[PDB]
RNA sequence: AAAGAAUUUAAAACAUAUUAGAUUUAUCUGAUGUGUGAGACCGGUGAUUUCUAGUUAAUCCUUUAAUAAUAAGGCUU
RNA sequence: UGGAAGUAUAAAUCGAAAAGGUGAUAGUAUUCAUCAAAGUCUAAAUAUUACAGGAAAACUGAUAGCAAAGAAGUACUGUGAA
RNA sequence: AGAUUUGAGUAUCGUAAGAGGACUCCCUUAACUUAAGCAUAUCAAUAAGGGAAGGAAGAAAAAAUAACAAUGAUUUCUUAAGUAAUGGCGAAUGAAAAAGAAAAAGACCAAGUUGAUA
């Protein structure tokens, strides 16, 4: 098959051939608008793996995000805090830049559903992704039993609640076991359950 | 006493009261009742294995598991696809633990299969399975004669000897009979070793009055009732030193370190 | 309400104003402004430690001690001195452990027949005392729906086979029925006074040895 | 029973049973176990002399199920079966049937030797044995059996 | 009568029963591995290894791999694959 | 040197030997035998533990599947 | 984070695989055990002091009980949030 | 001239927005308070600020436990348990396997194969 060589090839990102194509692609995206639509995915192997299907209702959107770390938004770097909270630099966002970029695409395209996103390239300033989006009101998506789960109401703004793979990884859902004791079924819900003080009806 | 109370956080919004407890009982019971009304053996709580518990603290107690392994279904001659539709839980994730686990859960399925009665997929009396079971009836009766007669010849010695020991214990409440049965049992086992059976048995499908039972795990008991065990005190047991055997076992394991160090020097 | 009386932005005016230091309502334009605040001594404030719905309503008692008291409550029902002292008219009853035939109970289907049985065994002296002395409650409890205050009469204890005669006895004023297995101090010693006048049926009486056993 | 409290017997007394000189104020020396080494040191010294410090080695993830080992002494063995069974086999010896007192089924893993045993043979089956437990069982004329 | 609870031969006497399946590649993965290698080449950090292995500084090559791969076992495998391709040319 | 039957019928891991279909590669993929891994002894064999006298080794406790050399943690001062 | 020579997330750099992860004391080695990440969906058992419709109460009884038992978030105050 | 790629305008048929947010999933480095002072810690996934949904939501079918006579998706309750551990080892913080129940259910993509290919 063709796609067993494209997948093997794409793992050699440090090669000269792939570094040249990434260099050209990042130049073009640095001048187009921040969020815009591309006709077909530039990485059709990785897009298909995450869920892209070349059918009606599947669209691909490229988002450019400014990577690195920003400062704590305090005016003139002045916070009235105890020395344990006085740091301005070196504070990292919990949500990965991929999940942050997915939300911007979702907010911009409010009538579609975010499926997943993958990595394209980066430079000294930017990092570029491509987001797979599905139109839930297309007749093709609705009438296909394997994909009409996206038409459920709870999928409205999937990435904002934290249901996409990029967003779910930031929630802690990367594995199972005793390493993920605090993220069993949701870190905040798990915390509330452990903190419940059960007062039985008949107690000593 | 140095007090340890974790009330310095907001416990008032952490309080959960059980005022809904008397009403949960009614709610769950009404759904259990409604489930049996809908399709009665759906609440039958599909049959489950008899697995041991974990750790040395619990390992001597049996408890219900989740689903029979695919090796236990083959041993009991059940199709794994048909098992889920006749109230049998299946767990392909479970790897077989022992031969004894395989045997014990093999009789659990066999005992369940004899009790089970499957109604025809179509109520009308002209259903195929009802028609086929009438068509091959003469072949089954011919086959039943061979099974009955050649069972009746293979167990002639074992059945007769088993009667003797049963009466031997009755009169005594013996050594000669026990030796005889033990020697026969070895030969029968050795005869079987010196061999192709049905892949799947038949599903028992018939028409019967609907006696509805709410589960099957309470019908097939996990373990037989326990009684006082008594043994013949012999000279061999009187001289067995359990303390010496435990310290030898403890010291042999602790001596595996010195063995490894000795070679490497 | 957890937010009752604490729904203000009140702060104290301090000293130097010839007024106490209790917090005061803020703003102007109404008579409410400058008044008292949350404090329990003030008007429209929160009370002393407000009552919380997670109190300890229901209590726990050991099961064996629960059964110890029921047997003592059953045993006290066979003492006419204690049964009468509780306020029961049992002068005309033949035997104080009054047991009726299970064949007679099986034919009872109407309240006219249930009354007939009570008259025959001379138990209507208690049933009529409750009827004749029914009165109304004395206090604020009438606003809450509790208006009529009645007295206690005979208790009818039946078995498993007397489940059709319950509907007859239930409408008779001051006659409470119970099942032999479901007995408790709330029936046998109402008001914490022992010696309820119990009317047994044949099946319930013959089951008492199985349920409780003996001293051996 | 709020009618039986002391507040109902102190209605009328100004200080409500807390003193006039030393009032009933908010704190009496801190909140909790404060001042464990400064002003409550004479308390911790008196009543918990080993409260502060460290001792022993840390077990990062202890397995408390591995230290589970219920134990029964020899004098309590025959109660596992009853005094009626004990009298039935009182006059047995080597050669004929003797009851087997298994302890794992009753939940005891180890047998220790304390007190005395009835002068009868017995077969005690358990996971672990003590050195003095096995002496007392063998001296009475019995046997020791291992399990698991 | 019922083994022993201590030592190497510890446990109730039973007949324990699982296949140690080997996750691996097929014979065609040799072709895909080689084809991709020609179409791509060697990374910057692999080439520096290939020079060190040419000079016979095998220990220094492993230390370089451990820096760029983060595992002693993964560094050994990379040092084996790099020197295997050295003998091919 | 002296005391010891040892519990009882439904089995997969594959170390291997032998063939079958393919591959040239750091080569594999099916199936048929065997042992492993097996356990039901006939007063006596004896698996097994103990005792003595040597000899080789290891020895303060822990890092919880087992060991090893570094490292770390214990206990006393 | 209870996770202690790093339990989880993220950022800078680096970056695998003829697979490999884990067995919570860092390290290398050989065994053993148990799984096979980096895509997706999934009823049932669970929560609820929005709001609506009901039923109950050892709850309050007009300075109480919601702030509000009457055209109550009304009269009135402030530029305004309130 | 023709075949494509990409990007637009217009027309048609639809989709998002706003209200509510008690319960649900997340972002953010508050402080009062406690430690009899206080600076790490505590208050504390707490307050406020911000986003997104449903009648429930979240999770869900082992790169999971365990070291056993072994288990077996997710969720919730009992217990483990104020325990192991964390901490100016101070004040304080603080789980999970086992075990007992409620309920129970498993399925698809990608990759691989079939190509007078659809």
UniProtKB/TrEMBL annotation, chain A:
Q: Which GO terms describe its biological process?
A: cytoplasmic translation
- What are the coiled-coil residue ranges? none
Looking up Pfam families in the UniProt record yields: Ribosomal_L15e
- Organism, by scientific name, is Entamoeba histolytica (strain ATCC 30459 / HM-1:IMSS / ABRM)
Q: Name one GO molecular function term.
A: structural constituent of ribosome
- Recorded protein name is Ribosomal protein L15
Q: Which PANTHER family match?
A: LARGE RIBOSOMAL SUBUNIT PROTEIN EL15, RIBOSOMAL PROTEIN L15
Family annotation (Gene3D superfamilies): Ribosomal protein l15e
Classification via SMART domains: Ribosomal_L15e
> Of which family is this protein a member?
Belongs to the eukaryotic ribosomal protein eL15 family.
Q: Which domain of life is it from?
A: Eukaryota
Q: Which GO terms describe its cellular component?
A: cytosolic large ribosomal subunit
UniProt keywords (A-Z) are: Ribonucleoprotein, Ribosomal protein
Automatic annotation (TrEMBL), chain B:
Q: Coiled coil located at which positions?
A: 151-173
Q: Name one GO molecular function term.
A: RNA binding
Answer whether the UniProt record assigns the keyword Ribosomal protein to this protein. yes
Listed InterPro entries: Ribosomal_eL13
List this protein's GO terms for biological process. Answer: translation
Q: Determine the domain of life of the protein's source.
A: Eukaryota
Provide the Gene Ontology terms for cellular component. cytosolic large ribosomal subunit
Cite the entry's keywords alphabetically.
Coiled coil, Ribonucleoprotein, Ribosomal protein
Instruction: Establish whether keyword Protein biosynthesis is in the entry.
Output: no
Q: Which family does it belong to?
A: Belongs to the eukaryotic ribosomal protein eL13 family.
Name of the protein in question: 60S ribosomal protein L13, putative
Query: Which species is this record about?
Result: Entamoeba histolytica (strain ATCC 30459 / HM-1:IMSS / ABRM)
From TrEMBL, chain C:
| Sequence ranges of Gly residues compositional bias | 28-37
According to UniProt, the name of this protein is Large ribosomal subunit protein uL4
Q: Which residues of the full protein are shown?
A: 55 to 270 of 431
Q: Which family does it belong to?
A: Belongs to the universal ribosomal protein uL4 family.
**Highest taxon listed in the record's lineage:** Eukaryota
Gene Ontology biological-process entries: translation
* Any GO MF annotation of the entry: RNA binding
- Which species is this record about? Entamoeba histolytica (strain ATCC 30459 / HM-1:IMSS / ABRM)
Question: Where is the region Disordered?
Answer: 23-42
Q: Does the keyword Ribosomal protein apply?
A: yes
UniProtKB/TrEMBL annotation, chain E:
**What is one process in the GO biological process aspect for this record?**
cytoplasmic translation
> Where is the signal peptide, in residue numbers?
none
Keyword Nucleus applies: no
**Entry keyword set:** Ribonucleoprotein, Ribosomal protein
Q: Which InterPro entries match?
A: Ribosomal_eL36, Ribosomal_eL36_sf
> Which Pfam families does this one have?
Ribosomal_L36e (PF01158)
One term of GO molecular function: structural constituent of ribosome
Note whether Ribosomal protein occurs among the keywords.
yes
A GO CC annotation recorded here is: cytosolic large ribosomal subunit
**Any idea what this protein is called?**
60S ribosomal protein L36, putative
Q: Which organism is it from?
A: Entamoeba histolytica (strain ATCC 30459 / HM-1:IMSS / ABRM)
Q: Per the similarity annotation, which family is this?
A: Belongs to the eukaryotic ribosomal protein eL36 family.
């Amino acid at each position: 098959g063709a796609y067993k060589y494209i997948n093997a090839l794409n793992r050699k990102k440090q090669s000269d051939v792939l570094r040249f194509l990434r260099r050209i692609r990042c130049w073009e995206l640095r001048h187009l608008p921040r969020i815009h639509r591309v006709a077909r995915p530039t990485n059709p192997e990785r897009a298909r793996r995450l869920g892209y299907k070349p059918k009606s209702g599947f669209v691909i959107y490229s988002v450019r995000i400014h990577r690195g770390n920003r400062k704590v938004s305090a005016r003139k770097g002045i916070v009235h805090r105890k020395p344990a909270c006085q740091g301005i630099h070196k504070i990292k966002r919990v949500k990965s830049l991929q999940a942050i970029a997915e939300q911007r695409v979702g907010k911009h395209c409010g009538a579609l559903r975010v499926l997943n996103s993958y990595f394209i390239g980066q430079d000294s300033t930017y990092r570029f992704f491509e987001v797979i989006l599905v139109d839930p009101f297309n007749a093709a998506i609705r009438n296909d039993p394997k994909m009409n789960w996206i038409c459920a109401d709870k999928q409205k703004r999937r990435e904002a609640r934290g249901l996409t793979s990029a967003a779910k990884k930031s929630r802690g859902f990367t594995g199972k076991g005793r390493r993920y004791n605090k993220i069993g079924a949701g870190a905040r819900g798990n915390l509330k359950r452990r903190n419940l003080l059960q007062l039985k009806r008949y107690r000593s | 006493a140095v007090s340890n109370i974790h009330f310095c956080k907001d416990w008032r919004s952490k309080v959960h009261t059980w005022f809904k407890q008397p009403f949960r009982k009614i709610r769950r019971h009404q759904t259990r009742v409604e489930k049996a009304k809908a399709v009665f053996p759906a609440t039958i709580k599909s049959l489950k294995p008899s697995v041991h518990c974990m750790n040395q603290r619990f390992n001597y107690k049996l408890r219900l598991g989740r689903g029979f392994t695919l090796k236990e279904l083959r041993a009991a001659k059940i199709d794994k696809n048909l098992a889920r539709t006749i109230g049998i839980a299946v767990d392909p994730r479970r790897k077989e633990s022992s031969k004894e686990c395989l045997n014990r859960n093999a009789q659990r399925l066999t005992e369940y299969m004899n009790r089970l009665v499957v109604l025809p997929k179509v109520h009308a009396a002209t259903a195929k399975r009802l028609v086929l079971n009438k068509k091959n009836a003469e072949a089954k009766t011919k086959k039943a004669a061979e099974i009955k007669k050649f069972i009746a010849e293979h167990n002639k010695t074992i059945k007769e000897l088993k009667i003797k020991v049963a009466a031997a214990k009755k009169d005594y409440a013996l050594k000669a009979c026990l030796k005889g049965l033990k020697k026969a049992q070895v030969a029968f086992a050795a005869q079987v070793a010196k061999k192709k059976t049905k892949q799947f048995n038949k599903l028992p499908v018939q028409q019967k009055e609907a006696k509805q039972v709410l589960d099957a795990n309470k019908v097939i008991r996990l373990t037989a009732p326990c009684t006082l065990e008594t043994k013949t005190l012999t000279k061999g047991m009187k001289a067995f030193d359990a303390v010496a055997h435990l310290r030898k076992a403890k010291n042999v394991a602790k001596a595996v370190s010195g063995i490894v160090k000795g070679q490497k020097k | 309400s957890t937010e009752a009386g604490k729904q203000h932005s009140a702060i104290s005016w301090g000293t130097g104003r010839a007024v106490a230091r209790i917090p005061r309502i803020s703003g102007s334009g109404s008579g409410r402004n400058g008044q008292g605040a949350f404090g329990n001594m003030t008007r429209k404030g929160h009370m002393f430690s407000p009552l919380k719905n997670f109190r300890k309503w229901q209590r726990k008692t050991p099961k064996q001690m629960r059964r110890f008291a029921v047997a003592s409550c059953i045993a006290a029902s066979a003492v006419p001195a204690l049964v009468s002292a509780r306020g029961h008219h049992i002068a005309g009853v033949p035997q104080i452990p009054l047991v009726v035939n299970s064949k007679s109970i099986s034919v009872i289907k109407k309240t006219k027949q249930a009354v007939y049985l009570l008259k025959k065994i001379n138990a209507y002296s208690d049933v009529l005392k409750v009827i004749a002395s029914k009165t109304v409650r004395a206090g604020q409890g009438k606003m809450r729906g509790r208006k009529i205050k009645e007295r206690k009469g005979p208790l009818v204890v039946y078995g498993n086979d007397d489940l059709q005669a319950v509907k007859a006895f239930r409408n008779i004023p001051g006659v409470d029925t119970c099942r032999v297995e479901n007995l408790s101090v709330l029936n046998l010693a109402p008001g914490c006074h022992m010696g309820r006048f119990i009317i047994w049926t044949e099946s319930a009486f013959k089951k008492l040895n199985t349920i409780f056993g003996t001293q051996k | 029973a709020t009618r039986f409290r002391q507040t109902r017997r102190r209605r009328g007394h100004v200080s409500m049973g807390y003193g006039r000189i030393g009032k009933h104020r908010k704190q009496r020396g801190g909140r909790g176990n404060a001042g464990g080494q400064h002003h409550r040191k004479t308390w911790f010294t008196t009543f918990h002399p080993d409260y502060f410090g460290k001792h022993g080695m840390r077990v990062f993830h202890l397995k408390a199920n591995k230290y589970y080992c219920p134990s029964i002494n020899v004098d309590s063995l025959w109660s596992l079966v009853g005094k009626d069974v004990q009298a039935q086999y009182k006059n047995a010896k080597v050669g004929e049937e003797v009851p087997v007192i298994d302890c794992v089924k009753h939940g005891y893993f180890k047998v220790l030797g304390k007190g005395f045993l009835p002068k009868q043979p017995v077969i005690v089956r358990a996971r672990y044995f003590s050195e003095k437990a096995q002496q007392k069982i063998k001296a009475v004329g019995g046997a020791c059996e291992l399990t698991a | 009568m019922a083994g022993i609870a201590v030592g190497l031969k510890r446990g109730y006497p039973v007949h324990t029963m699982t296949a140690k399946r080997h996750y691996g590649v097929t014979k065609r993965k040799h072709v895909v591995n080689d084809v991709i290698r020609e179409a791509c080449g060697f990374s910057a950090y692999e080439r520096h290894m290939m020079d060190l292995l040419r000079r016979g500084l095998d220990k220094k090559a492993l230390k370089y791999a451990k820096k760029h791969l983060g595992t002693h076992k993964r560094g050994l495998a990379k040092r084996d694959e790099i020197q295997r391709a050295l003998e091919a040319i």
